[PDB]
Every structure is written in structure tokens, then in C-alpha cells.
Amino acid sequence: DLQGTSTAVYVGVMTHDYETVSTRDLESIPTYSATGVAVSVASNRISYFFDWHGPSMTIDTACSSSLVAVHLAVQQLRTGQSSMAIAAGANLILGPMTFVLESKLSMLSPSGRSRMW
Amino acid sequence: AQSMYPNEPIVVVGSGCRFPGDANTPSKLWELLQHPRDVQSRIPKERFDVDTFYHPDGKHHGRTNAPYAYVLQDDLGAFDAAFFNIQAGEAESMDPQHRLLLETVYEAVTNAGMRIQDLQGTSTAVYVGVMTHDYETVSTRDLESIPTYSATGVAVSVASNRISYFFDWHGPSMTIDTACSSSLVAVHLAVQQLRTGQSSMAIAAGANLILGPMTFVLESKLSMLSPSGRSRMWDAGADGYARGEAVCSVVLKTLSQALRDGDTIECVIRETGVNQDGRTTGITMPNHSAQEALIKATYAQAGLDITKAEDRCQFFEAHGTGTPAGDPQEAEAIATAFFGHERAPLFVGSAKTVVGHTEGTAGLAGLMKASFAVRHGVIPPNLLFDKISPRVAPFYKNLRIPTEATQWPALPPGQPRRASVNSFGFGGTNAHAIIEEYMEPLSLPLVLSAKSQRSLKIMMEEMLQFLQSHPEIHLHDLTWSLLRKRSVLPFRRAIVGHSHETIRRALEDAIEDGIVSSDGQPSVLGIFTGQGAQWPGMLKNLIEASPYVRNIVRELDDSLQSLPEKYRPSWTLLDQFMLEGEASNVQYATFSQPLCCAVQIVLVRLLEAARIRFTAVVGHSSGEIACAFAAGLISASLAIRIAYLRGVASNSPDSVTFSGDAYHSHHMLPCADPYMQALEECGSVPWYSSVDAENRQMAARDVTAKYWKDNLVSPVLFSHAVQRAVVTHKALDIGIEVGCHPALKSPCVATIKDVLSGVDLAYTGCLERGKNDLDSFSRALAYLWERFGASSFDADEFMRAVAPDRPCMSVSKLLPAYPWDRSRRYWVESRATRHHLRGPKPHLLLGKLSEYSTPLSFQWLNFVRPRDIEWLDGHALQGQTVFPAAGYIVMAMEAALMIAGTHAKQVKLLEILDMSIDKAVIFDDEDSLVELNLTADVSRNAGEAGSMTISFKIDSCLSKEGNLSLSAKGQLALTIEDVHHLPPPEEEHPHMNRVNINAFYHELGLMGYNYSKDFRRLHNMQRADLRASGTLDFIPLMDEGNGCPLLLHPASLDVAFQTVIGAYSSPGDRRLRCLYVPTHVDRITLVPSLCLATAESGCEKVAFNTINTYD
Amino acid sequence: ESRATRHHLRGPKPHLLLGKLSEYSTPLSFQWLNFVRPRDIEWLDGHALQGQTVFPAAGYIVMAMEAALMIAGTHAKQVKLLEILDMSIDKAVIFDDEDSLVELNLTADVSRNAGEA
């Protein structure tokens, strides 16, 4: 039903740990690494698999990335150019690059939990 | 109008560009685009030595086939961190993409004619399109040495978040990533945001920088990059795209918003549709049907009919990456959208041919190309287009690729030039934008500012050079743009000059001086010069130059005519003394009084026209009358009339001037009676009288003729009036001596300091002693601005009142961009990371030397697969392709060579000792990758003794899931020099049975040795008495990346090893009943000079002797 | 999981005075990578020469002995005796400030693995 339609995609990812992990050693990089780890492909490949023709943004506004993608999907749907919009987000802990980067600023919680307020 | 479209059209008010080929500004970018040059160049070593990663085979492991890119000539490490209040650590942490984005956004804001303060705290939006985060993978490749602020400096989202943070903006800050289309998709999002009205302004920016080979290797793995190094759009040479560096910032606003804000429009983004390719034949493969639908929907949403030529665009900035398959799809999509429903052709020009494929900002690069083309009405050419691609010819019937700066085609009247921008990112996210040109149906001080005094001096120098280059530009427009349409910064300096020559000389004087001010304050203290301070020829320049001053002079003439016939006319000094060149002396009361009064009236009227809020303190005589006018309750005509009629002091606590044998004495005591009597029949701002002390400082009793009489009879309490005004308004910002300055500067400022103990307020005089009136007024405005920013006065209103004809055009586009300090280079070249980006050539059989390799310890890292090493398929054992045991020896000898080169030594002799092959390397398939790590520690660097002992170990791992294991080890004893060694070969054995080489290799294959092609290479051999001798091919091997020959082709050394087997086993005798592989060598000794000489001389066919000692 | 990348993500504990063992380290060849700064090593401020904080010459010996321990553990061997021979300190390490990072790379090639002997 959605195959070939104008369904939109808006993916919010802050971390690309795989792209820095799989590509840390330039050797052994697989042939399709560019499209497999490129951030934009996060949404472009979703649309490609589902044959969708709506906008495919891989948003990155840090922690808000996914909600910003939700906002963009809302705008697209209100425009009426997309009968459907996938507001998605993704964050995975595949390498310590992000962990070291954030702990350098003490952003991460040493206790290991987000003790709200 | 052009704003009547179904969706409000977005307009590019400004742009900031850092494009390759010195295109560090929109003007240079346009000049390059319409006059393209071979911008592309070999990747600079400062970025990364691509020769360390180059290899003809794009699919080669850890290599890139594209050693060229359209790289920026700017040193991206340089950055004006002080400008953005960024610490050195954070600046080093910052991704150069983010830094250049900040610089380009500020450049566009300047070009848009918008001040940081004006946009500070507003809801301006940001949408940044970046595809590559090379810095984040480069600065973070070595987790050690990572700076503290690395997370926020390299995080992609910060690309936009930091722009907004620096500019204090509150609009959405998206760092889009749709691959090549990222920036154009960001433009679309900005368009949507602006159409929602939630953001008065939106920065649609993009950034792609070549800081590391990660992206290059990734893309070359798919052959996406162009090995030729250029994006040959729709050309038969289409073999990919050439990566380009670019950081583009485009300021976007609603057309109505821009017009009401009066920003210099570049082009109108009528509509920006975004679509994505479906399940195409591959993720990278674009879909022509999807792009055609995108174009059709974009045109429909703009109220434009695709079929109709009037609505259809004349130019189409295409993705045009030179991809072998993407370009035909794009051409088909364009042709079907604009044609196929059936005659001049439609022009299609891809910006990626000139500035290269800038990836994330490729969309914005094309957008800038289309914008400049539509604005200047010139279709820029495409540098790389020699012959139409055969796959593109079928869809090229109705399309033309311009190779020259072709002029825009014919247009219907009233139809703006229309161009299209298209950008396809791998994955298929296609962004299409429709752009249209906007139809467009006394000198202010030249103010310059910077965040650093050095930057301000560079600003002055660049402005002087620009003026020398652009003397034609109107001075009023330039000054107004620098005042209202330009940001104000803590370091300030304002120049004074009537005309371009005067402004240039004043710029030179300011540059010589170096005096610059440092770091909502419009209030001023109106100080009025009294009688006796007048200078010859006051207002002559203002009257002769400013028509507004001429109208004020007409008002003064009317006031003169208003005098009763008893005294009318007090001879018109306005036409008798206020003349340039003559400037006759004026001290007589009849002329000195009205002259000074008119001077002060004109000055205060001009200041009010500049929207300067006043707190008025009266002087004496003409000063008193002019101040009474400044209160806003007395008409100017009445004040000048009173001054004309009268024509016929405690300055400070420590300075007084009591006149006499004059005014305020018995001399004028009776003379003021007729003056008061005639004044009775002859005629909102805080105002403080000095004739009376705080009692008649009122808004109703100042009009009484008695007060006017007392003006000339009472001792003026100017000090007391100043005290009252300053103490009452403790928040006073500055005081201006309105009139013939200097008359009260020292006493008035001393009074201000005394009243406000130890507090010195700004002082200014708008008409200097015997100086040009224009220069004096401009200097007063300069003081006001340098002290209190743009809030000091409103230049727009001043130009509205002064010289209404030719309203100032915002020429900030033409003004030079802010000169960034660039004194310090902010980068994170971790020495391991630097040795990764930089380093030695990727030596064959060894790969790239490890980042953590010393001159004493080395570890060459390689992932050998047989197909990459063309000759490695020959050495096959039991069918499996086995890395030759001689391969380890060749690798060790090459490691010895590289070690000697590191120490600058040259190896006269190369010995190996106690070598061992612990584990043979087995290649499952020609594409299988086996890691080889040749560690080498020089245990004894004795170049003083002419020797070098090196312990080497070739570690191997047959699979990524396996552990690293030893494959070979041993020692290398090198006899070296600071820049006959071997025994002569034994006399050939007398009797030797000829060996049938083909039969010999057949027998070996029967035993298990599947030697093939280059590894056979045994011209002849003859064996006897356990010995063998003959001729073997010393085939040369050279690494193209390293550009030098190797000591040994492992094929030749493995053939030499096969000589031992031949001596042991004759062909067809089956003595070699089991497959023997080398497992230990007591000593291999090679003379590198002779081997290199044989390899280069072409006499590869060499002789050999071997003794099968143990059998 | 490129074996170098795997040894980066995985691997031995980050031994003090040595850092993390290099991704390309064999049971026969080792290269411990570290970026020593005095404040991270609480005790390193003590050894100051001419005012400058200098990495102790005994620090290199301790690092070498710990490298020997890790090598023996890699081969599962336990060191009954630990000898150093012909050691040399070619260049002293000078720390400009307690936050200054100085890279230390302890390469170690076991020239003779004679556990049989």
C-alpha cells in the first residue's frame, strides 16, 4: 500500500559510532561501507526499501534530533505533500568514541544513571 | 507582484561562501563560475598525504582512487576564535566544518545587510547540511589526546547549534544530512520554517571538508569517486565524481519580510520540493522517475506549469556528478519533466564540474550558481564537458550543457529569469529548488568595527583598498551600509571625510594612528555654544552640500522676513558670510548672534533627524536661544527670529569669564529694553535653564519676553545648569557642544566631572574651529557611534531626512568580508593521527607504517588479498593461494630499506639471520583479506660501526574473527653507509643434467606446489651431485604508489628456493614425496645495490647456483 | 569487527604506565600506547627535575617489567624471575605542565620465547 507512495522519512541520529568503528581501520572496510554507515542513508535506505518518495532526512540536533525530525514530519504532513511520515530516531553504543568524547566534558553520569532533577 | 504565488516565495538576502579556487566570498565564487579554471588539485599534504592512500584500484583495501579534489586554498586550521568568544581548546575541538560555517554565516549576514545585534536574540532559524564529519573521525581516531570540548566541537548537530549559540538565535537549528542533497534539503526546511512565519530569518548552510581519507576510502570502495579527479558532467569520461571542499551559508527570509527589512536581494527561492528515490536498482542508483516526479511537484507547488515555457525554467543546475549511471538517470528525469509530451534547448549546468562535488553543500553550491546566474542573467559554463555521454545522448535532445558564459535565453516581458537547482545524495534523497531573479519594480561617518584591534586595522586597510578599487560606489550608500546594514563590534573606529578622496586620506590617517575604541544609549546632553565662539564661514560646507541644510536656510530666511519692518532685515549672513571660500570674519553682534543661532539650529535639527534624544542645557545668548529651540517647545523660526532681533559667565566651578569693558553688564542693560519690547511683537525635551537656577528651568515661563531679556542681562549660570542636568539624569551617556566648538569643552567637561565626582562622560563637538562643517559633523557622529554602537543614532532616518533623493542602497554585498584574524591555527593533529594522514608512501608488501612507529621501532600494517597483489596468485600450495615464504623475506628487506631511509642510511649489504616461518599464510580466495603486520625493532643501531641489527616479525591473521599470529620472524643485519660484498659465486658444477622446467613444475604440482605464472619464471636449470644451477628471471617489482622498485620480486626469490627442491628432486623421480615449505633460514644475504641495478637495467634474466646441503 | 578494531573495543585492561595495548599487537610483539600527563598519574608530580616534572627513569623500568608481566600472561606463563639487560635512557621525558600529554609507546618484541627452556 505504501510502496511507491510519497511517504516521508525523518530520522534523528546523534551518534554514528559504527562509521567511526567499522572505519577506524581503513583496511578491511567493506565495499558498501560508504552507504552502509553514511548518516543520511539511515533514512534514505528506509525509503529505498519501502519504495517511498517522500523526503528522507537524517536529522542530527544531538539529543533533540528525533523530536526535531518529528517536527519536520509534522510540517511535511501539514503541507499535504506526504500522506505519511516516519519520524524515527536511532542511538546505539557500538564504540567508545562517543563515550570518551562526552566524558571529556563530564556530560555522562559516572553513577551510570540519569537521576532526573 | 512576485509574492502572489501559492506559497510565499523565499528570497536569498545574503550569502557566504568558502569555495575552492580562492572563492572565499560570493563575488569570487561568481567570477569563478562564469570564468571557470582548473581549480582541482592534488590533495594538499597539510590535509592528508593522499599519496599515502592513493591506488589505481578504488576497491583496494584502505586506498582511494581519487587523489584529486576541489580543495580550499585556505588554511582551515586558522580561525578567528576571539571573534566568536571560543577558547583555544574548544576551537581545536571544533570541526573545521563548524568554524567555516560560522565564518560563512557571518559573511552572509554582513552581505545580507543584517547586524548581529539586530538578529541577536531573535527567532532566526538555522539548517546546516553536512554529509561528512571527517574531523570527528580524524581528531577522534586516537582516543588519547582528544581535547576536552571534542564532543561539542565535532558533534554534527553542533554545526548549526553553535551558529545559533554565537548569534544568540532562537530559531530551529538543524544539521541536516541527506548526503549530497543535505544542504538543499536544509534550504527546503528553512523555506518551510520561514513560510510558517515562526522565524524571521533562516540560515540554509552546508559544509563539506576533506580533512581525512575516511570518506575518500569509503566512497572509492564503491568507485563513486572519479579516478580522473574531476566530475565530468554527462561526459563520456564519466567515471564518478570529484570530492570538493566548500562551506556555503545562505540567508533566507520571506520575500515580504526581506522587502520590509530592506535587505539586498540575491534571488527568489520560489519553491523547494524534496523527494526520495524508491527501491532503485541499488541504494546509490538514482531513480529518473522519482526525480521527474520531484520536479513536476515542485513546479506545481510553485503555481508553475512544467509544459509551458513561460513557467518552465531556462536554466537547470543539475546534480551532474559525472557518475556513469546517475547522470543518464538525471538527464532522463529532466527531459521527461520538461519534455517528452510533444525550439530552443534548455540549459543545464552542474556547479559540481567547476567547484567539484562538495557533497553535503553540493546542493547549496548549485543553488549559489543558479542564484548568481539568475541575478546577473548569465548562464555559467561547465568546465569539464568535452563529449556528451552515450548514455545521456538519448535524453540530451532537448538539453544543452553550456561550455561558455552564455547569455540568458529570450524571456517574455514581465517574467523573471527562472533557474532550477537539483541535488541527489547517495541513497536517493533528491532536493529540487526553483529560483527566480527578483524583479525589483553631508556624508555619514565611515564606521568600521571588529572583535580585535588587529582585525579592525585590517578592516580599515581592506576598506581603503576596496575604495581604491571601487571609487564609483556612492559614499552615502557605503556609509549607511556600514552603519545600519553592518554589525557593530567591541573594537570600533569611524572615519571622517566629505568625499572618496577625503575618506581614503582619513583611512590612511586612522591606520597610522591605531587609536580605536573598545567595547541602547542614545541619550545626549545638548550643550550650546554662546556668542563670541563663532568661527568664519560656519555651515558653508553644510549649506553648499546638503539640500536639507539649504531648506533649513530657507526657513531661516522666512524667519528673517518675519521680523518687523522696524528691524527687518538683519542682513542675511546666510548668503553674505556662509559662503565657501570667502568666510569673512563674523564677530559683530548683528551677524555673530544670528549666525551662531542658525548654526546651532541646523546642528540640532540634523541631530534630531538622526533620532538623537536630548537633555538640553542653555549656554549664553545665541547658545541660550538655540537651546531653547532644542527643548521642542520653541519653533526653530522663533529662535532664529529672536537671534536676529537681539543682533541689533560661570562656565564651570573653576572657570568663569565675566565680560565687560559687553554682555551681562551695564553696557547691554539698557540696550535689551527695545529688544524685549520688540520680542513681545516679534515672537517635550528635558530643558534646564542657566539664566535662572532651577526656578525657571520650566516649560512655560521660558517663553516670556522677560526670560529672553534676562538671557543677555543675567550672569549665565551655565555651570549650575550643567550640574542640574547631569545630576538629575545620572544615566546620561554623552554631551555634545552644539554649535561652534570649542567654546565650552574644557569647562563643561570639568563641571560634569565635578558634579559626578571622578566620572568623565563623553564629549563631542559637531562644528570644529575653522574646520570643514561636513568633517566636524561626521566626526561627531563617529564619536557617538564609537561610544554607543548603532543605538547612538539612526542612520536610516538621517538619510531619510538628508538627501531623500537616491535612498541609500545596501551595498554590504560589495563591501569586503570581515578579515578573520587567522593568526593562530586551531587543529588536532595527534602525532599518531598525523602519521596516519601523512606518512610514507604505502609500500607494497608492507602497507602503511603504523602511526606509533619510531625510528627505532616499526610496524608496517597491511591486509594482503591476492587480487590486489597481481602476482600473488602464482604461489599456490595444495590449490590454496599461499603467501610465498620468500614474500616474508622480501617484506623484511623492504622494511630494512625503509628503516635505513628513516635514519638516512643506505644499505651496502643486507643480511638476514635465524629467520623462521612459524605459520604459512593461507588465502581462501583472491578477495580474502589477510592482515600482515611486519614489526621491526632495530636492536642495535650502530651506524657508527656501520651495522644495524633489526629483529623483525611478520604477524598474520587469516580472518577478522581470528587473533593476530606469527607467520615469520628473524633478524636483519645491515651493513650501511651514511648516504664484492658477497663471495663470488662458486664455479659451476662440471657435470649437470639439464632439467625440463615444464616437467619439473608438473612434478611439483603433483606433490602440491601449484606454482603459476610469475612464480615459475625459471628460464633453465640443471642438477647433479645434489647441486643445481641455471638461469632464473630476476623479474622486477615496483610499487606505483611508492614510485620506486623493490629489491626482490618474491617470485624470483621463491624460484631460487625452488632451485633447492630441483637439486633435491629431479623432474619425474618423485623424490619430493611430500610438500616442503620453508620454515627456517639460517641466513639470507642480499646486496641491494646489485638487485636494484639488475631490476632497473632490464636484465632480469640472471644466473643462480644452489647447494642442497641436507637431503 | 576488524581484528584491530575488535582489539580496540575489546582487549586487556588499560594497564597503568602503559595504557591500552596496540590493536596490532601479537603474542610475540607488543606496543602499549599511552599519553601520560602528571595529573592523571597522581604520583608523577613528585619526580621533578630542574622544576620540570620529569618521567622517572625508574618509570621506564616499571613499565618494562609490567610489559613483561603482560607478555607472560599472554602466553599464560608466570615470571619467577624478571631481569633487564643493557637498558638505556636515551631521552628523558619532560612534562611542561600537569595537564600536558606526553605519548609513551612501549614496544616489546620477545626475541626468544623459550618457555621450553
PDB file of N, CA, C and O in Angstrom, chain B residues 742-775:
ATOM      1  N   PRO B 742      35.461  74.612  19.569  1.00  0.00           N
ATOM      2  CA  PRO B 742      35.411  74.573  21.034  1.00  0.00           C
ATOM      3  C   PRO B 742      35.022  75.903  21.669  1.00  0.00           C
ATOM      4  O   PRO B 742      35.649  76.928  21.397  1.00  0.00           O
ATOM      5  N   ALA B 743      33.991  75.877  22.512  1.00  0.00           N
ATOM      6  CA  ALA B 743      33.565  77.060  23.247  1.00  0.00           C
ATOM      7  C   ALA B 743      33.371  76.736  24.722  1.00  0.00           C
ATOM      8  O   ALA B 743      33.506  77.612  25.582  1.00  0.00           O
ATOM      9  N   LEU B 744      33.054  75.473  25.021  1.00  0.00           N
ATOM     10  CA  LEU B 744      32.756  75.064  26.388  1.00  0.00           C
ATOM     11  C   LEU B 744      33.329  73.692  26.724  1.00  0.00           C
ATOM     12  O   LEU B 744      32.979  73.135  27.771  1.00  0.00           O
ATOM     13  N   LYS B 745      34.198  73.132  25.880  1.00  0.00           N
ATOM     14  CA  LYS B 745      34.644  71.755  26.069  1.00  0.00           C
ATOM     15  C   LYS B 745      35.261  71.561  27.449  1.00  0.00           C
ATOM     16  O   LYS B 745      34.738  70.810  28.280  1.00  0.00           O
ATOM     17  N   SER B 746      36.383  72.232  27.708  1.00  0.00           N
ATOM     18  CA  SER B 746      37.071  72.047  28.983  1.00  0.00           C
ATOM     19  C   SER B 746      36.210  72.442  30.172  1.00  0.00           C
ATOM     20  O   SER B 746      36.066  71.626  31.100  1.00  0.00           O
ATOM     21  N   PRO B 747      35.627  73.645  30.231  1.00  0.00           N
ATOM     22  CA  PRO B 747      34.808  73.981  31.407  1.00  0.00           C
ATOM     23  C   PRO B 747      33.612  73.066  31.587  1.00  0.00           C
ATOM     24  O   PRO B 747      33.296  72.684  32.719  1.00  0.00           O
ATOM     25  N   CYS B 748      32.950  72.677  30.496  1.00  0.00           N
ATOM     26  CA  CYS B 748      31.759  71.843  30.620  1.00  0.00           C
ATOM     27  C   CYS B 748      32.116  70.443  31.103  1.00  0.00           C
ATOM     28  O   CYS B 748      31.445  69.888  31.981  1.00  0.00           O
ATOM     29  N   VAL B 749      33.171  69.849  30.541  1.00  0.00           N
ATOM     30  CA  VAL B 749      33.565  68.513  30.977  1.00  0.00           C
ATOM     31  C   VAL B 749      34.074  68.554  32.413  1.00  0.00           C
ATOM     32  O   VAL B 749      33.837  67.627  33.196  1.00  0.00           O
ATOM     33  N   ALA B 750      34.772  69.631  32.789  1.00  0.00           N
ATOM     34  CA  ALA B 750      35.201  69.774  34.175  1.00  0.00           C
ATOM     35  C   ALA B 750      34.003  69.876  35.110  1.00  0.00           C
ATOM     36  O   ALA B 750      34.006  69.294  36.199  1.00  0.00           O
ATOM     37  N   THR B 751      32.969  70.616  34.703  1.00  0.00           N
ATOM     38  CA  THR B 751      31.757  70.700  35.510  1.00  0.00           C
ATOM     39  C   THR B 751      31.093  69.337  35.640  1.00  0.00           C
ATOM     40  O   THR B 751      30.621  68.967  36.722  1.00  0.00           O
ATOM     41  N   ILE B 752      31.046  68.576  34.545  1.00  0.00           N
ATOM     42  CA  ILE B 752      30.453  67.242  34.595  1.00  0.00           C
ATOM     43  C   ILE B 752      31.217  66.364  35.578  1.00  0.00           C
ATOM     44  O   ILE B 752      30.623  65.651  36.395  1.00  0.00           O
ATOM     45  N   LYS B 753      32.549  66.406  35.513  1.00  0.00           N
ATOM     46  CA  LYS B 753      33.352  65.593  36.422  1.00  0.00           C
ATOM     47  C   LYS B 753      33.161  66.029  37.870  1.00  0.00           C
ATOM     48  O   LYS B 753      33.067  65.189  38.772  1.00  0.00           O
ATOM     49  N   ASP B 754      33.109  67.340  38.116  1.00  0.00           N
ATOM     50  CA  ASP B 754      32.929  67.826  39.479  1.00  0.00           C
ATOM     51  C   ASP B 754      31.577  67.406  40.039  1.00  0.00           C
ATOM     52  O   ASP B 754      31.479  66.977  41.195  1.00  0.00           O
ATOM     53  N   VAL B 755      30.519  67.520  39.234  1.00  0.00           N
ATOM     54  CA  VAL B 755      29.189  67.140  39.698  1.00  0.00           C
ATOM     55  C   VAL B 755      29.125  65.636  39.933  1.00  0.00           C
ATOM     56  O   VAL B 755      28.641  65.171  40.971  1.00  0.00           O
ATOM     57  N   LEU B 756      29.613  64.857  38.971  1.00  0.00           N
ATOM     58  CA  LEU B 756      29.727  63.406  39.103  1.00  0.00           C
ATOM     59  C   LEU B 756      31.176  63.121  39.484  1.00  0.00           C
ATOM     60  O   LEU B 756      32.021  62.852  38.629  1.00  0.00           O
ATOM     61  N   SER B 757      31.454  63.188  40.784  1.00  0.00           N
ATOM     62  CA  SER B 757      32.823  63.153  41.289  1.00  0.00           C
ATOM     63  C   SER B 757      33.619  62.018  40.661  1.00  0.00           C
ATOM     64  O   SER B 757      33.287  60.842  40.831  1.00  0.00           O
ATOM     65  N   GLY B 758      34.672  62.383  39.932  1.00  0.00           N
ATOM     66  CA  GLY B 758      35.552  61.404  39.330  1.00  0.00           C
ATOM     67  C   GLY B 758      34.980  60.673  38.139  1.00  0.00           C
ATOM     68  O   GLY B 758      35.570  59.683  37.698  1.00  0.00           O
ATOM     69  N   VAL B 759      33.851  61.127  37.602  1.00  0.00           N
ATOM     70  CA  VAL B 759      33.186  60.477  36.479  1.00  0.00           C
ATOM     71  C   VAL B 759      33.305  61.392  35.269  1.00  0.00           C
ATOM     72  O   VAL B 759      32.807  62.524  35.287  1.00  0.00           O
ATOM     73  N   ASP B 760      33.958  60.902  34.220  1.00  0.00           N
ATOM     74  CA  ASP B 760      34.143  61.646  32.981  1.00  0.00           C
ATOM     75  C   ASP B 760      33.223  61.060  31.919  1.00  0.00           C
ATOM     76  O   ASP B 760      33.338  59.878  31.578  1.00  0.00           O
ATOM     77  N   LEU B 761      32.319  61.884  31.401  1.00  0.00           N
ATOM     78  CA  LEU B 761      31.403  61.480  30.348  1.00  0.00           C
ATOM     79  C   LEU B 761      31.939  61.908  28.987  1.00  0.00           C
ATOM     80  O   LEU B 761      32.772  62.810  28.872  1.00  0.00           O
ATOM     81  N   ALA B 762      31.443  61.240  27.949  1.00  0.00           N
ATOM     82  CA  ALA B 762      31.879  61.539  26.593  1.00  0.00           C
ATOM     83  C   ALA B 762      31.522  62.971  26.220  1.00  0.00           C
ATOM     84  O   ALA B 762      30.475  63.492  26.611  1.00  0.00           O
ATOM     85  N   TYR B 763      32.408  63.610  25.459  1.00  0.00           N
ATOM     86  CA  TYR B 763      32.193  64.963  24.974  1.00  0.00           C
ATOM     87  C   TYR B 763      32.454  65.004  23.476  1.00  0.00           C
ATOM     88  O   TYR B 763      33.334  64.306  22.965  1.00  0.00           O
ATOM     89  N   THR B 764      31.680  65.828  22.774  1.00  0.00           N
ATOM     90  CA  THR B 764      31.739  65.873  21.321  1.00  0.00           C
ATOM     91  C   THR B 764      31.367  67.265  20.834  1.00  0.00           C
ATOM     92  O   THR B 764      30.520  67.942  21.422  1.00  0.00           O
ATOM     93  N   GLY B 765      32.015  67.681  19.748  1.00  0.00           N
ATOM     94  CA  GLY B 765      31.688  68.927  19.081  1.00  0.00           C
ATOM     95  C   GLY B 765      31.396  68.711  17.611  1.00  0.00           C
ATOM     96  O   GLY B 765      32.234  68.174  16.879  1.00  0.00           O
ATOM     97  N   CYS B 766      30.211  69.126  17.163  1.00  0.00           N
ATOM     98  CA  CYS B 766      29.773  68.877  15.796  1.00  0.00           C
ATOM     99  C   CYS B 766      30.241  69.936  14.806  1.00  0.00           C
ATOM    100  O   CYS B 766      30.039  69.760  13.599  1.00  0.00           O
ATOM    101  N   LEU B 767      30.853  71.022  15.272  1.00  0.00           N
ATOM    102  CA  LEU B 767      31.426  72.033  14.386  1.00  0.00           C
ATOM    103  C   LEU B 767      32.728  72.512  15.012  1.00  0.00           C
ATOM    104  O   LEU B 767      32.711  73.216  16.027  1.00  0.00           O
ATOM    105  N   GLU B 768      33.848  72.133  14.407  1.00  0.00           N
ATOM    106  CA  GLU B 768      35.166  72.385  14.967  1.00  0.00           C
ATOM    107  C   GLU B 768      35.705  73.735  14.497  1.00  0.00           C
ATOM    108  O   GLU B 768      35.228  74.322  13.524  1.00  0.00           O
ATOM    109  N   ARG B 769      36.717  74.222  15.215  1.00  0.00           N
ATOM    110  CA  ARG B 769      37.327  75.515  14.930  1.00  0.00           C
ATOM    111  C   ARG B 769      37.870  75.579  13.508  1.00  0.00           C
ATOM    112  O   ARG B 769      38.858  74.914  13.184  1.00  0.00           O
ATOM    113  N   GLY B 770      37.236  76.385  12.660  1.00  0.00           N
ATOM    114  CA  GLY B 770      37.751  76.618  11.325  1.00  0.00           C
ATOM    115  C   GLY B 770      37.911  75.377  10.481  1.00  0.00           C
ATOM    116  O   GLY B 770      38.686  75.388   9.521  1.00  0.00           O
ATOM    117  N   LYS B 771      37.201  74.302  10.807  1.00  0.00           N
ATOM    118  CA  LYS B 771      37.279  73.058  10.058  1.00  0.00           C
ATOM    119  C   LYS B 771      36.055  72.905   9.163  1.00  0.00           C
ATOM    120  O   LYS B 771      35.072  73.641   9.272  1.00  0.00           O
ATOM    121  N   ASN B 772      36.127  71.928   8.263  1.00  0.00           N
ATOM    122  CA  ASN B 772      35.006  71.650   7.379  1.00  0.00           C
ATOM    123  C   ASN B 772      33.791  71.236   8.198  1.00  0.00           C
ATOM    124  O   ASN B 772      33.885  70.389   9.090  1.00  0.00           O
ATOM    125  N   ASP B 773      32.643  71.844   7.891  1.00  0.00           N
ATOM    126  CA  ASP B 773      31.423  71.524   8.625  1.00  0.00           C
ATOM    127  C   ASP B 773      31.036  70.064   8.431  1.00  0.00           C
ATOM    128  O   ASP B 773      30.645  69.382   9.387  1.00  0.00           O
ATOM    129  N   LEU B 774      31.141  69.568   7.197  1.00  0.00           N
ATOM    130  CA  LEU B 774      30.867  68.160   6.937  1.00  0.00           C
ATOM    131  C   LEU B 774      31.769  67.272   7.779  1.00  0.00           C
ATOM    132  O   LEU B 774      31.306  66.314   8.410  1.00  0.00           O
ATOM    133  N   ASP B 775      33.067  67.579   7.805  1.00  0.00           N
ATOM    134  CA  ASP B 775      34.002  66.769   8.577  1.00  0.00           C
ATOM    135  C   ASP B 775      33.684  66.828  10.064  1.00  0.00           C
ATOM    136  O   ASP B 775      33.738  65.808  10.755  1.00  0.00           O
TER     137      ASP B 775
END
